[model samples]
Target: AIGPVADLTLTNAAVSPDGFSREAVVVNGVTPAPLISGQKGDRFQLNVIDNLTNHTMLKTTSIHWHGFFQHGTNWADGPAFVNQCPIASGHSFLYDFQVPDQAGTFWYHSHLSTQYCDGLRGPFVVYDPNDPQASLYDIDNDDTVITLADWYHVAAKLGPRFPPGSDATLINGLGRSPGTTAADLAVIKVTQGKRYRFRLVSLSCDPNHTFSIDGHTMTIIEADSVNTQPLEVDSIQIFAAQRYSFVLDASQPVDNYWIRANPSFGNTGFAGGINSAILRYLGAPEIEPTTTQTTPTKPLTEVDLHPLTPMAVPGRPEPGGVDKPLNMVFNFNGTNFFINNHSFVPPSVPVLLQILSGAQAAQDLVPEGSVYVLPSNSSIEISFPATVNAPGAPHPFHLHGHTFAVVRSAGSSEYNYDNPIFRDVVSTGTPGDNVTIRFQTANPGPWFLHCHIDFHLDAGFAVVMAEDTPDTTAANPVPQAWSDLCPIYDALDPSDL
Candidate 1:
């Protein structure tokens, strides 16, 4: 029998991705959950079933479809207690939404408390039938989807030094640990003389990776699901939850090449091909690549990328030119990261539900000091000034329901108001740096703006952007299933949650 909705069952299983056995949250019987692909404008009806038995790792679940502007379906935009309550254990919740006017490399993962760090992430690709860059590549499919992640030996719940580094760098779900280099490495195949669109997705919960392929150059066409002008680069330092679609031509000799992903933290380098994989060409022997790595002369930077087509920056050239400009100062109170000195703590009533139930003002929201209101159809600019507090390491910030242009990037004194690349996630750079972004307020309802690092997010590095609060109910009609969610979740005992 076939079901109407696609099923994603969550479970805790023992797996050794890096030759180290440990418990992790697996989706549909696999860690780094199965690829979910569809054509542009297609409706994705996913029925998420929480069958988790591991109480040690958070039993409740919530899946956020990252990079999708859940325009009219705000209720389906998953962020535990921000859009909807976390789906309780032994229950099923439906996320039904359409990806309209968007097609590129995107992904989905658990939005619950550090749960995605336990291995519940996957690539979500929406293809465009008339893709502008489609003619540049011969093959573009799930086979070319390469994922990079930070794998840990222990469960996510059992770790966190405020923020924890990874145990191994997982390039396409397999890599060697620091202690063992004989472990199996993931192999990526390509036919000689063929041009393929290699969609690289970084599902890291913490660390950013410096990714490169030996003996080949990559022409990047997409950044975080936004099609961009082709920029050739030898290497890319991808931050957490970021994605890039690059075209790789297998014009080299029929041999194996090294595919490396060295993280910013954790066991770095290629002592025994650690944090590495094999790029095997057709007819090549099933063996490790003896290719030597090269230093990158053309490494990717924020200012180097630009949109494929000219997209106008709203308002004026300066931050004060926007309809609403907010300078959110980042701070660490020794325990949690805060935006403008406001640390976020989940409320009992979901922000969206509270708005539907007559709480229209952001100031009147359940969780005080955690929500910022955005007026409808207005250009908004936000500047995140980095702080010396906490680790002082770069933090990749992501906004739900919309993508923004980096008007001014961290560590750069220049401001680009003409045609900056628009992406959903961006790094805040180092301490004392000012990273600014600008976007228009079109999507109505509560959308989470947070650091993409799971550990940082767990330590209160987030806030809810309550956009067009008064128009939320009219813009998004709550489904019966969504309306019944909180009741079922609230009645559950705290021990399971």
Candidate 2:
């Protein structure tokens, strides 16, 4: 693990993650940047240096600590033109926040435009000193952290508007792509008889991966950094930005097993070891196992997950039992995506800055339909109903500053107010599926709720959750560095930004 203290310098370099060398966004000179871990309640001070000089792809950048509840440090929640403007090229900003209440698997990625797709993503884990599930696994170290990502061959700003799929599916930053040979595969070594807590993080920008390990069944204990009741499963379909901590007991024979990540889109199979990694037992030979994959009878589903400790759902089990019951309509206009017929365009002034400047009413905010204001300490219920206008299937939606309860999962009519799993990211299934979620409006300031698919979000599939606008300035004090971002960024030429 790199640090609870580290300086991140964002730059572009030519690297081949999947046998295809291309210019990609890298932090501290590495992609899948570096595993950053800390104990719960520890303050993380990350200094972000934007050294990007590529004007075509993007010169400016902002990083979002995905899945972290930036309670009082909402100014550090990195979403360009929302929490704060993008840090201009050749400038630096410090992101200081404390994870006092979170412990488990999480990740961080560039939040400026489609920059993450260019490779600014990494794993972040917060360990609990007295975890309830601590006794279940023997090892939880740097080697146990695994990240699955989609690799691209072109610069994000130069790629096709609506890309069909990625060039390759990278497992732990290494994998074989189509028509490529001699590409090294990521190896995860596990000692025999040792139970391991494997933290699976999906850093994918678009595709959802159906992940499985040959000859092993995993017992899931955590989802999106939230502890869950133990549930054994043969496979997990993890969407973009979602995470899981599963217990893998390495009792199998001393041999290598295939670790497969079958992406939902481009270059789908494990042909020629594409989108594949290796899980090797101690004393195992350095040869690939001919192990075959079986059809999963106990595959993981959203409904199968429940909290480790029972947590009450925010609203009544019945429909419309909250201060704000919003039914968001999803649509696609061929060129761009929309919610409730409104396309999200970045405002000149950030939503938080507007609130700090005394714009309390939602109507007074620029980009009117893009901002939805909520009262402080209110119960919020939101439903995302799929429509025929949706361009893609199973869009994963992520909300900043909160891990919401999945009261009603997609394709299910029943709402489970008693005990449903909470997650930071949830998938809205096929057309006609209505996915419902509930959370409390505790964190004040602008939070971005958007499709995790980078392309879709670039096309305007997002909304700014202007939560507790009246309490914004009082709850979150702006840092001097954060206040300097907009001024420096605004001075750059339009073409360079």
Candidate 3:
């Protein structure tokens, strides 16, 4: 049933860079847009054509599709204003889902607003036909997405830009200034020993990245998209939105190597910041008529190699028992940003989450307030305090549907909250330095606990869930288009301001 169609227009315009061009907006014009192959159960459709006019007057756009589970198919799960609404200004909205039972490397942004960090977003890849593990190491035959963005020439007067307060951090979305060499950085042309997969997608809202490639030694295999077994690293740490899928092995020795991408902290005060590219090596007579351009060195210690202990997520289930421990605390006071300490008001009535026993109980779980879902062994205790005193900025903590396991930090005097080390995304250390995480709710439903920086989840951080219960035949049924979109979800309120 290989039904793949893919169109995705969403136009905006102006996207320069590569020697001081600097424009910005860019979506299909490329910033992080372009990379959507399919083939797992294949039947996808996706049309989405917006064109933009201030995101159609903030009626609040919608494209999401991120992770893709759609729980019993919530009408293809594009839930923006709720169920559907906001695709105006040229209108178009297909979606059509199917290709995801579980594959690898996923992404598709623009929940409206934040314009997905000003550049929308991309990269979806599925593939997995039979996959008996596909040989073992080296799927280099051909497949490279490499997203990792964050750019805002000004972020349109700085109101909302993905996660970054201002913006300026890209990879496949290339950005630097002066003649931007290495073919603008999004390049991937190999053939020395083959085996190159490199999926990687960060979308950066608050840097934590540190993926290296100078000499070469990557073999991650898979993460976020599942299927991990292989593991060999030299450098790889991505937070903010997170997603990795490695396999590089160009064989080495041809010369020219420097894929460097940085920002794991090391500027001393605000912490490090650097982005680069250069993996030339067309030498060895493999067929390289001519095309040379190099110069990318000077960046060694910024310390980065913890995609949560080399990309955790292998096997799941391990937090022990599970009942209720929820302890979130990601404070930041240099200006403002809190969670658990409360700041994101937005609640009139629709907090649900009371299944209690099983087979769907107290209903009304998540008509769409954004997210929330926990129940599969249950046990969450996230904390990030990290005391510093004053000037501070470096969050990274993110989760939108599973990935946790960093049990202790802040002094680490044997603070084992049940043998922690797994990770979906974690990076917190400053101001009291507390950092402790543990997960085991397995993967049930609505999930998100944000702080990947994107302006601190639009200045409120983030959270949502009411999870696991569904069985009383199906409980609430509701769906007259979700009751005609329940008054735009009660007029939404992330603390409205």
For lDDT, the strongest prediction is 2
lDDT (10s digit) by residue, model 1, range 1-497: 11224799999899888898889999888888888888887888999999998877888889998999998899998898998988988999989998879998888899988989888998888889999999899999878999998998877877664545788988878899988689999999999999999999999999999999999999999999888999999999999999999999999999999999999988888898898999999999999999998989898887888999888888899757899998877888777888877888888999998899989776799688889888999999988777777464699999999999998886787889999989999989887688899999988989999999888888888999899988999999989999888898888887888
- What's the CA RMSD for each of the models? 1.7, 1.0, 21.1
Q: Give the per-residue lDDT digits (tens) of candidate 2, residues 1-497.
A: 76687799988898888888888889889887888889899999999988998877688888999999999899999988888999888789999999888899999999988989898999999999999999999999999999999888877778788777887888889988887746888999999999999999999999999999999999999999889999999999999999999999999999999999999989888788888899999898998778888899899988989999887889677889988899889899889999988989989898899999999898998789988998989899999987778878789999999999998887677788888999999998887688999999999888999999999998999998889998889999998888888888889998777
How does each model score on TM-score?
0.98, 0.99, 0.31
Instruction: Order the candidate numbers by TM-score, best to worst.
Output: 2, 1, 3
The pairs that clash in candidate 1 are none
Model 3 agreement with the true structure over 378-432: per-residue lDDT tens digits:
6665566654431234566656445465665534533443334444556666665
Candidate 1 residue runs with Cα over 4 Å from true position: 1-5, 390-392
Give the Å shift of residue 260 in candidate 3.
4.3
Please list all clashing residue pairs in model 2, or write none if there are none. Answer: none
User: How many clashes in each candidate?
Assistant: 0, 0, 25
Tell me how far the alpha carbon of residue 72 in candidate 1 is from the true structure, in angstroms, after superposition: 1.4
Count of backbone collisions within predicted model 1: 0
Candidate 2's clash total is 0
